[PDB]
Amino acid sequence: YIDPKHLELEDRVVAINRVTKVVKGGRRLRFAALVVVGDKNGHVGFGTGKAQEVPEAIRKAIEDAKKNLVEVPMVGSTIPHEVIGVFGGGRILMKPAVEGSGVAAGGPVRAVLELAGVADITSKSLGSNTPINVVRATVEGLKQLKRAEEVAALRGKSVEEII
Amino acid sequence: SRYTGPSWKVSRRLGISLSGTGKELARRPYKPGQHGPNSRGKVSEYGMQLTEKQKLRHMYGMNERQFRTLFIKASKIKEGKHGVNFMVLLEQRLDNVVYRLGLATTRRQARQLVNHGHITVDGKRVDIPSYHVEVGQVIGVREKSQNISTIKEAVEATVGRPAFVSFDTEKLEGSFTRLPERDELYPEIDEALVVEYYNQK
Amino acid sequence: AVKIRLKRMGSKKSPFYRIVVADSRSPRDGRFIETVGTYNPLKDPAEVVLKEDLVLDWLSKGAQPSDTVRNILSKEGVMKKHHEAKNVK
Amino acid sequence: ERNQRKVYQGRVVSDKMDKTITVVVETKKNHPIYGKRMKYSKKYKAHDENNTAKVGDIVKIMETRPLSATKRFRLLEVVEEAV
Amino acid sequence: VMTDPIADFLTRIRNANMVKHETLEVPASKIKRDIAEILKREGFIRDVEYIEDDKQGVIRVFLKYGKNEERVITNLKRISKPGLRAYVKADEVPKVLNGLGIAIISTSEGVITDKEARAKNIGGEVIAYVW
Amino acid sequence: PTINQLVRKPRKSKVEKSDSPALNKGYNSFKKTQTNVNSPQKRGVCTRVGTMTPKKPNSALRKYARVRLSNLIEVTAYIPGIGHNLQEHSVVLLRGGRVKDLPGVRYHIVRGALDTAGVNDRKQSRSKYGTKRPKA
RNA sequence: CCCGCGGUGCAUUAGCUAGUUGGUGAGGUAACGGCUCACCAAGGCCACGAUGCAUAGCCGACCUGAGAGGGUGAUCGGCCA
RNA sequence: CCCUGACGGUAUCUAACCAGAAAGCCACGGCUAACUACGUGCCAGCAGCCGCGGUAAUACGUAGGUGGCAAGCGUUGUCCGGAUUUAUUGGGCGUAAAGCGAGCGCAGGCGGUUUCUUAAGUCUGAUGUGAAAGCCCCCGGCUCAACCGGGGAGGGUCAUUGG
């Protein structure tokens, strides 16, 4: 559902891009921005927007980025289990880590992971490294994380019966 | 080698005091050189991890090989975290013991006092500053010739005596009561940026 | 010609020795049959550790000590026991 | 004689020589890199006091000592005859 | 020609699960009945009923869905294959999905779950992962 | 592949090759030339000197030499820095390093190591170019 | 001294063997044995890679890698020549 | 009881005197931490890959400053990683590289349901062995550390025998 944008959020630039469009005569140029948004507590969204200058671009992107947000469960500063997120040529593997190990993750994925309050996790990109598709694949892989309570509820069991 | 330079340019480059809050960053809190007051654009996330590592390396005045071996040694504990155990092993070296106890103002002075052979652990002299002081070992001041000018005066003016340090100002014996904690130790710089800096070394 | 002799294991000027039973043709630090105790020339009253239940078994099979091994095997009372088992029955 | 030799099993393959027969003992073993199991064969020569056993028989043999340039086994017994 | 009936069973379950309807039928077998009971005990299936007329079959499975029609089994995988078989030792028994999923192992004393095997300390052929 | 195809015929990888191949040499004295003896440098005698013009779009006259090596195979080599003292039949030392000016050159001579001489103005990276420390 | 199993490239290298494979006896050796003799027979090995050509002392170990692996066999110990 | 040291008057310990004898190499356009002057003008030169140099060059050469390491600092050569770029772990074949022009078939690879049996694969227990030194875990000695010593684990696709 909508996690509504009413929190304390620390944004971050992940990329910018000089992008043209050839017209009669010469050339036009815009700037596209990629931004992440979160509160370092388990709510993270991404969003992009373009404008004619860099501040206006990053602004429209934070506008967009706040409209989407994901819940990102965790069990004590570490993801519940192992997931693989795939979105269009970007494949990203994520594993649970050891207490106080840090985040070993590449450029785009570490921004996403740090602004959700993840502390100890290992990653690897077995795919392409275009920033947009890496971010989208990472968020695609968090959405597969299952809480321990929900599984016990769906089946006819209790917890401490399946762990 | 150790280091002998102006020692104050160093603090202006890290943005941290490094000398017991006695202000090197009083006037001109910016960096040295021509392009000091005229700062420039952003710093990478490599510059940040490097700056944290350099802050910690210059705090206790050691070299890069020894810093890295101490870090590799702290990684074999697996009781707690890996940055906390590091910054705690860093504190148990005989130079910090003389600094904390209060027999010296700076850490350079404490280093020269332990190098020139003026202190003793358990009665026996020990001369090398990277020594590893364990918990519960009364380090003393060479009861042969403890009548020196600077040691005497720097015992009087106690700017900082901690909550893990024990001491008596008559026999001049000190010791650690127990191991410190991060709340009790510079909760200002880091121990996570430094751990990440060594992941890709 | 099985022997019971010393084998050097120090660094350069701090020697240490293992007490070992070896064929006499072997190199001093080469191959051996088994190890029987330890001996430390520093440590002013020198330190000897040894099993003394394999020494008595090798001695009765014809092994022979070197001169220093015999000294430190009599300070332990192993030669007297050999004496009291062989020529007494 | 408290120590024991090696006995095997196989199907006779050649019986042309006088007093000597080739026995193939067969087994499966795995691949070092990949997993699956391949079958493997090696031939043995064994001694025959009277040129008895024939092809298709399922025999047992036992290890002896050098009896020739190649033969190291003797014929224990015939378990199951071909027809 | 059919060469892996266990894989065919698993793919029927997954195919009928993804299109989200509530029944399924297969030709019966002693191993498929075993894993249908194991699937029923843990909470993935709702029921299983056994008809049998004049050939092997059949076995009817009744799938199970959440409160908002979401799915309780999310995928299903065949591990040992005819062509590369996978045997596991008592200390190699796997833990699928950090305990939130199950593995199915055939041992000298039944076709059992992976908990029941690392409680007995044995191993065997690995049939499937269902998480 | 199926794992049966793999078992019938395994996987084979590609073979890598140096870009300084005249530095794994062997003598031509008694019998023939031996390839085991990877060297960091080789020496030789320069059989010519001079200049040549670079590729597109650079523009210069870049100094070079041709050198015969102890193992008797011939290569050309760039001489760097500003100003040298190399003439016909002077003995020199080569290291690896390929220039991107023209084809056929894959080596550098090292300044101040044999008959060749260090450059005589440098003040800033004298460890290359073989200049000694001046009192200035 | 004999045996099981294990570690390299080439199929733009498919046929190799005539004391060769087995039997009888005789000599010979610490010792069994084509080990060597005389006679009798026509056998032996190979696509699960024989034969040939090229390269190489083998191992405990050492470097690197999350692991599975990959690359080396210098100081020190063992076996060989 | 008595008798023997090449190293060697070596390590070491005590007294006096003096800040006096003891800092260099690489880099600073992006990757990748660290910028301004002057000289020169597609020249002289630089480059690991992008690429610099034709009058105001943070990319050439000097000076001032700054960054990294430090009794060392850079360069070349060789090997593993990054390289899922030979993919068992762990990739692919409509148009990017890649389905033989098609069939028939010896050897091989893989095979429907079920009752009893066997024990070759598979799983499991006990015993023997896998030297010493190494890596690793605990403990101890050299003022510390490198280093040295004591006790352990580990390493087989191994053998024998019982389920």
GROMACS .gro file of C-alpha atoms (C1' of nucleotides) in nm, chain H residues 59-136:
model
   78
  943A      C1'    1   4.713   1.665  -1.889
  944C      C1'    2   5.392   1.915  -2.153
  945G      C1'    3   5.860   2.168  -1.845
  946U      C1'    4   5.980   2.449  -1.379
  947A      C1'    5   5.843   2.702  -0.898
  948G      C1'    6   5.507   2.751  -0.458
  949G      C1'    7   5.147   2.455  -0.227
  950U      C1'    8   4.894   1.982  -0.134
  951G      C1'    9   4.806   1.420  -0.105
  952G      C1'   10   4.985   0.891  -0.026
  953C      C1'   11   5.364   0.599   0.196
  954A      C1'   12   5.807   0.613   0.461
  955A      C1'   13   6.437   0.373   0.550
  956G      C1'   14   6.229   0.322   0.165
  957C      C1'   15   5.961   0.477  -0.278
  958G      C1'   16   5.846   0.391  -0.797
  959U      C1'   17   5.917   0.087  -1.284
  960U      C1'   18   5.940  -0.364  -1.581
  961G      C1'   19   5.839  -0.921  -1.575
  962U      C1'   20   5.553  -1.367  -1.378
  963C      C1'   21   5.106  -1.588  -1.139
  964C      C1'   22   4.560  -1.595  -0.894
  965G      C1'   23   4.132  -1.227  -0.836
  966G      C1'   24   3.806  -0.892  -1.025
  967A      C1'   25   3.630  -1.239  -1.548
  968U      C1'   26   2.926  -1.607  -1.459
  969U      C1'   27   3.514  -1.402  -2.021
  970U      C1'   28   3.449  -2.243  -2.077
  971A      C1'   29   2.920  -2.108  -1.650
  972U      C1'   30   2.941  -2.873  -1.168
  973U      C1'   31   2.870  -2.464  -0.816
  974G      C1'   32   2.733  -2.073  -1.239
  975G      C1'   33   2.573  -1.889  -1.943
  976G      C1'   34   2.354  -1.957  -2.404
  977C      C1'   35   2.151  -2.074  -2.994
  978G      C1'   36   1.390  -1.649  -3.405
  979U      C1'   37   1.673  -1.104  -3.566
  980A      C1'   38   2.323  -0.980  -3.154
  981A      C1'   39   2.824  -1.539  -3.220
  982A      C1'   40   2.548  -2.013  -3.220
  983G      C1'   41   1.998  -2.599  -3.473
  984C      C1'   42   2.386  -3.048  -3.910
  985G      C1'   43   1.955  -2.970  -4.581
  986A      C1'   44   1.668  -3.424  -4.434
  987G      C1'   45   1.595  -3.926  -4.288
  988C      C1'   46   1.753  -4.470  -4.132
  989G      C1'   47   2.018  -4.675  -3.756
  990C      C1'   48   2.513  -5.029  -3.468
  991A      C1'   49   2.765  -4.890  -2.978
  992G      C1'   50   2.623  -4.561  -2.576
  993G      C1'   51   2.286  -4.228  -2.241
  994C      C1'   52   1.790  -4.221  -2.020
  995G      C1'   53   1.322  -4.501  -1.929
  996G      C1'   54   0.543  -4.680  -1.726
  997U      C1'   55   0.258  -4.942  -1.266
  998U      C1'   56   0.335  -5.320  -0.893
  999U      C1'   57   0.460  -5.813  -0.499
 1000C      C1'   58   0.881  -6.093  -0.287
 1001U      C1'   59   1.415  -6.092  -0.261
 1002U      C1'   60   1.949  -5.916  -0.302
 1003A      C1'   61   2.289  -5.554  -0.133
 1004A      C1'   62   2.644  -5.325  -0.637
 1005G      C1'   63   2.553  -4.747  -0.561
 1006U      C1'   64   2.349  -4.483  -0.126
 1007C      C1'   65   2.331  -4.392   0.441
 1008U      C1'   66   2.548  -4.525   0.924
 1009G      C1'   67   2.877  -4.746   1.386
 1010A      C1'   68   3.347  -4.935   1.564
 1011U      C1'   69   3.893  -5.034   1.477
 1012G      C1'   70   4.379  -4.913   1.189
 1013U      C1'   71   4.636  -4.570   0.939
 1014G      C1'   72   4.681  -4.048   0.672
 1015A      C1'   73   5.530  -3.896   0.973
 1016A      C1'   74   5.790  -3.458   1.155
 1017A      C1'   75   5.785  -2.921   1.044
 1018G      C1'   76   5.381  -2.589   0.825
 1019C      C1'   77   4.814  -2.315   0.810
 1020C      C1'   78   4.462  -2.294   1.226
   0.00000   0.00000   0.00000
